[PDB]
Design an enzyme around this catalytic site. Structure first.
Site, short mmCIF file in Angstrom:
data_model
loop_
_atom_site.label_atom_id
_atom_site.label_comp_id
_atom_site.label_asym_id
_atom_site.label_seq_id
_atom_site.Cartn_x
_atom_site.Cartn_y
_atom_site.Cartn_z
N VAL A 98 -9.81 -4.00 -3.23
CA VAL A 98 -9.23 -3.28 -2.10
C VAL A 98 -7.72 -3.07 -2.23
CG1 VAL A 98 -8.83 -3.33 0.37
CG2 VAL A 98 -11.03 -4.05 -0.55
N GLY A 109 -4.98 0.35 -5.83
CA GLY A 109 -4.20 1.46 -6.34
C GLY A 109 -4.81 2.26 -7.48
N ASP A 169 -9.02 2.47 -2.69
CA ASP A 169 -7.70 2.75 -2.16
C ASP A 169 -7.75 4.05 -1.37
OD1 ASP A 169 -4.74 3.13 -1.95
OD2 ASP A 169 -4.73 1.40 -3.32
N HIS A 202 -0.38 -9.76 3.49
CA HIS A 202 0.94 -10.17 3.95
C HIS A 202 1.73 -8.98 4.49
CE1 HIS A 202 2.06 -9.08 -0.28
NE2 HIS A 202 3.19 -8.70 0.29
N1 LIG Z 1 -6.38 2.36 4.88
C1 LIG Z 1 -6.25 1.94 3.62
N2 LIG Z 1 -7.36 1.74 2.83
C2 LIG Z 1 -7.28 1.32 1.53
N3 LIG Z 1 -6.08 1.05 0.90
C3 LIG Z 1 -4.99 1.25 1.69
C4 LIG Z 1 -4.99 1.67 3.00
N4 LIG Z 1 -3.65 1.76 3.49
C5 LIG Z 1 -2.92 1.40 2.48
N5 LIG Z 1 -3.63 1.07 1.34
C6 LIG Z 1 -3.29 0.65 0.12
O1 LIG Z 1 -2.73 -0.67 0.26
C7 LIG Z 1 -2.29 -1.07 -1.00
C8 LIG Z 1 -1.34 -2.29 -0.62
S1 LIG Z 1 -0.68 -2.97 -2.05
C9 LIG Z 1 -2.14 -3.91 -2.65
C10 LIG Z 1 -1.68 -4.65 -3.88
C11 LIG Z 1 -2.53 -4.65 -5.09
N6 LIG Z 1 -3.97 -5.14 -4.97
C12 LIG Z 1 -1.82 -5.50 -6.22
O2 LIG Z 1 -2.45 -6.39 -6.81
O3 LIG Z 1 -0.59 -5.21 -6.44
C13 LIG Z 1 -1.64 0.17 -1.57
O4 LIG Z 1 -2.05 0.42 -2.91
C14 LIG Z 1 -2.08 1.29 -0.53
O5 LIG Z 1 -2.33 2.54 -1.14
#
Ligand SMILES: Nc1ncnc2c1ncn2[C@@H]1O[C@H](CSCC[C@H](N)C(=O)O)[C@@H](O)[C@H]1O
Ligand SMILES: Nc1ncnc2c1ncn2[C@@H]1O[C@H](CSCC[C@H](N)C(=O)O)[C@@H](O)[C@H]1O
Lengths: 357, 357
Positions: free
Chosen positions: A199, A202, A223, A261
């Site tokens: 989830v 990206g 994503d 977070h």
């Molecule tokens: N409604 C939604 N559904 C799915 N992804 C979402 C979202 N709103 C934001 N995001 C996604 O939230 C992510 C937060 S960053 C997640 C970090 C990643 N797993 C790592 O290991 O670095 C982003 O890539 C963004 O595109």
């Protein structure tokens, strides 16, 4: 005497006053490349030899010695007594690396140099001079904004900060790399899994790592439509766009890496709920994996809790961000409907939470 | 697995990386006057009450809370659970001071505020950004000179540094004051003494203190002809000019307060020898009292040795000065001819050495 009993009170006070010196001493050790030098010597190195390897001026040698003594006391080096070559040296002390310092050897998957360099960079420490002004002002902002006038991100993007940005993104890459090691050290977490949903994965960088250790796991990178949109490929690699607040793809497990977070308890609860439903078909066999910091205030490793609280304060002063405590993590997972959970400490002070329905 | 076993290595590494945060948190606590506020409230204070006492903006309250949590974990505050006033608060946590924090209450003989303020002043921390340049340059100078261009003393004397100088001399006075407490806490050291020579006692400031706790002790302030020259007065107060390297006045005991960390072993040995001769007439009843830092590397209180090594590193980076270890203190006193010695820890991490012939 009773009440007005100092000393014990002073030792404690000064110990915290002068803590910064230990950090600066570690900072020096890495910026000098002491670990690389000893490692390249591949044998306990003498003060002279190290001095010669670092090509230090003669006047700086005794400074190297002073820093070495403290660092040795702080367990970053082991002292040995070595031979000597006849008409010189007599009995001389040699220095060896220790597990902690070996982490500073570059060109290795475990090198944490760039990370320590960023964490101790002037842009991370100088702002503290504005702490009093920051506490007494009416504007809501990070301590960095208060002392600099601009946000941390805008500072890095400046032209005169090209190098500073390279350093921080080197640390970022260094951190995502270390994840690979987390996987290697906790395979039992992903062992009996047929599929997994990353989830907020990206573009799939983290899934790629997961695939390096677990080639047969069916991973679906989830994503937003725009961030994924196109992307395809592989029988075990999947890209699906959508909204994690409405619904997340079903799989044996759900991975939430650094995604909670950023959200408050309300938004975080909905994500956890949708996560439970996504594994719902696997019954009591499914699990939700949360990778984020968890501060155990009641832990017996006081030092670790302090380190965690320290880090949390850096997130406050630099980004106004927060990390959660173990109990508020518990409230979140229970309010979501899960039955139990297991916290596994990873990467020094971070955490890997396994949540079961 | 064997060898490549991280985690234990990382926790240790990060713990030292983020040590500075604990110092900055203490710094904040004092610059905000949290101790004075709670003390003035003279009853465990609530987050709201403290917030109101510090007149913080509402947005800064949760920042106060974060700093309080860490500081409490670091033992500077004790958490209590208090009543509440009916239709509000329900169950709220109150904060109390601890011996360490009580040291931050101003207008008290034990206040160490100014000292912590200087030790954590920007002029003490910013220079570290020049540590790499300092290690690799050919010029012999303090890290402060390397980063600032001028020596620490010249910096304070500047016109644009009027306030900075007041702060540091407030810390200096605060330190000499604390000596009075050292006397009060170690009377048995001066108990059976009829006379005493305060070597390098300058104008007699320290003797004055000694006289406040021990009115009947015959003290003779010894220093250079110019520094003393005139000065007289009292049956128990004495001023004699001369050269401590040639000879020092006879007395039941000799006090060497902060006079040996300025001289090398050679000059320090001569002073100790002349000190033994000055008490020589009192036989095995005379003693030499040394007040200066002693680092016990083999001590069981690792934290104290680290604090001592920390301080010693500050003396290096700021003045290029040094403190001695317990063993080199031993070599000095034995090479001088004494039979034994007793070290008494004072003022957090300092030492009071009693040397016997
Ligand atoms: N409604 C939604 N559904 C799915 N992804 C979402 C979202 N709103 C934001 N995001 C996604 O939230 C992510 C937060 S960053 C997640 C970090 C990643 N797993 C790592 O290991 O670095 C982003 O890539 C963004 O595109
Ligand atoms: N040859 C000598 N004989 C006696 N005193 C000397 C000396 N050379 C220097 N001094 C004195 O050495 C002192 C060092 S400072 C001593 C510190 C003092 N007892 C305190 O508690 O602060 C100075 O006051 C200086 O005047």
């Amino acid at each position: 005497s009773e009440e007005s009993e100092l000393y014990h009170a002073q030792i404690h006070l000064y110990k915290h006053v002068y803590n910064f010196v230990s950090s600066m001493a570690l900072k020096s050790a890495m910026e000098l490349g002491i670990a690389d030098a000893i490692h390249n010597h591949g044998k306990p190195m003498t003060l002279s030899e190290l001095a010669s390897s670092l090509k230090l001026h003669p006047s700086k040698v005794n400074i190297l010695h002073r820093f070495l003594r403290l660092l040795t006391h702080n367990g970053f080096f082991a002292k040995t007594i070595v031979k000597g070559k006849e008409g010189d040296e007599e009995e001389e002390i040699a220095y060896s690396l220790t597990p902690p310092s070996k982490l500073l050897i570059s060109g290795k998957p475990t090198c944490l140099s760039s990370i320590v360099k960023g964490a101790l960079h002037p842009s991370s420490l100088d702002m503290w001079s504005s702490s009093k002004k920051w506490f007494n002002e009416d504007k809501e902002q990070t301590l960095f904004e208060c002392a600099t006038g601009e946000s941390f991100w805008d500072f890095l993007n400046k032209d005169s900060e090209s190098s500073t940005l390279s350093m921080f993104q080197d640390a970022m890459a260094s951190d995502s790399r270390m994840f690979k090691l987390v996987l290697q050290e906790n395979k039992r977490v992903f062992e009996g899994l047929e599929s997994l949903v990353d989830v907020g994965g990206g573009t799939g960088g983290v899934t790629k790592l997961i695939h390096e250790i677990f080639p047969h796991l069916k991973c679906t990178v989830f994503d937003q439509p725009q961030v994924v949109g196109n992307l395809t490929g592989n029988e075990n690699l999947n890209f699906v766009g959508g909204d994690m607040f409405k619904s997340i793809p079903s799989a044996d497990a759900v991975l939430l890496k650094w995604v909670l977070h950023d959200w408050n308890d309300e938004q975080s609860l909905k994500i956890l709920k949708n996560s439970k439903e996504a594994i719902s078909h696997k019954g009591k066999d499914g699990k939700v994996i949360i990778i984020d910091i968890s501060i155990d205030e009641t832990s017996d490793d006081r030092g670790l809790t302090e380190l965690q609280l320290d880090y949390d304060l850096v997130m406050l002063t630099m980004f106004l961000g927060k990390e959660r405590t173990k109990q508020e993590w518990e409230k979140l997972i229970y309010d979501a409907g899960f039955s139990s959970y297991k916290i596994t400490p990873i990467s020094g002070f971070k955490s890997l939470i396994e949540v079961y329905p």
